[PDB]
Amino acid sequence: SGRAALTHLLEAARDWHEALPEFRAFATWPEDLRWADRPAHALPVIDHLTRDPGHASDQSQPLRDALVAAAPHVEWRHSYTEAEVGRDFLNRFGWFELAGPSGHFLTQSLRVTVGYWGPGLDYGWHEHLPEELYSVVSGRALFHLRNAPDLMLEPGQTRFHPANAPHAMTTLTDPILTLVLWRGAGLGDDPRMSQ
């Protein structure tokens, strides 16, 4: 059951939000989330995530395992073209919207997305109007942000991306699985590569 796996995932995401003060500071968890009955859409990333979801902390393991169990049931998205990121990146990365205007659960109060990148990928400079708050669920990666330090983030660490500030991320030997909140002007916009 897709419905059961996604409902269990939503519970794990809510618990994760409640447990992270930076997430509580960024947005209140919505009281109106509704099952959307959005169908699954498979992309090649599923098998990479399932075989190699990344090291979890004891605190992040329930969410990581819920994400792996949800993988065959979510609507995976890519966003970028082969010209922009290359075929290997498209094979070994993807994202989906867990909650939000077009989430597996609908709400207009918040947007929650999830991304996976296998090892050895360089997600180049990209940007968008809405603010975003990353968390790492499992794995680790190096996070770049214009006008700010580089940070190597591990499970449970977070990073705020202010509106329109370009950011980027590199995985080295480990993959990374993330769960991200969005807010502000432009909510519902997708990232674009910086020009």
Q: Is position 27 an interface residue for Br ion (rule: CB under 5 A)?
A: no
Smallest separation, CB 134 to Zn ion (Å): 8
The residue with its CB nearest to Br ion is 108
Do residues 176 and 54 touch, judged by C-beta distance below 8 A? yes
Q: Is position 18 an interface residue for Br ion (rule: CB under 5 A)?
A: yes
SS (H, E, C) the chain: CHHHHHHHHHHHHHHHHHHCHHHHHHCCCCCCCEECCCCCECCCHHHHHHHCCCCCCCCCHHHHHHHHHHHHHCECECCCCHHHHCHHHHHHEEEEEEEECCCCEECCCCEEEEEEECCCCEEEEEECCCEEEEEEEEECEEEEECCCCCEEECCCCEEEECCCCCEEEECCCCCEEEEEEEECCCCCCCCEECC
Smallest separation, CB 93 to Br ion (Å): 26
Query: Of these partners, Zn ion, Br ion, none, which one is at the site of residue 132 (CB under 5 to 8 Å by kind)?
Result: Zn ion
Smallest separation, CB 17 to Br ion (Å): 6
Query: Of these partners, Zn ion, Br ion, none, which one is at the site of residue 148 (CB under 5 to 8 Å by kind)?
Result: Br ion
Residue that is written with structure tokens 């990344």 in the block: 54
CB closer to Br ion, 73 vs 111: 111
Where in 90-119 is the site for Br ion (CB under 5 A)? Answer: 108
Contact with Br ion (CB under 5 A) among 42, 106, 142, 148: 148
Q: Do the annotations mark residue 82 as ligand-binding?
A: no
Q: Which two tokens stand for residue 24?
A: 């509580």
Q: Do the annotations mark residue 97 as ligand-binding?
A: no
Do residues 83 and 12 touch, judged by C-beta distance below 8 A? no
Q: Which two tokens stand for residue 94?
A: 């993807």
What is d(CA 117, CA 143) in angstroms, rounded to the nearest whole number?
13
Smallest separation, CB 24 to Br ion (Å): 8
CB closer to Zn ion, 5 vs 123: 123
Smallest separation, CB 99 to Br ion (Å): 8
Q: Do the annotations mark residue 128 as ligand-binding?
A: yes
CB closer to Zn ion, 62 vs 191: 191
For binding to Zn ion (CB under 5 A), which residues are involved? 132, 191
Binding site, by residue number, is 128, 132, 167
Binding site for Br ion (CB under 5 A): 14, 18, 29, 33, 108, 148
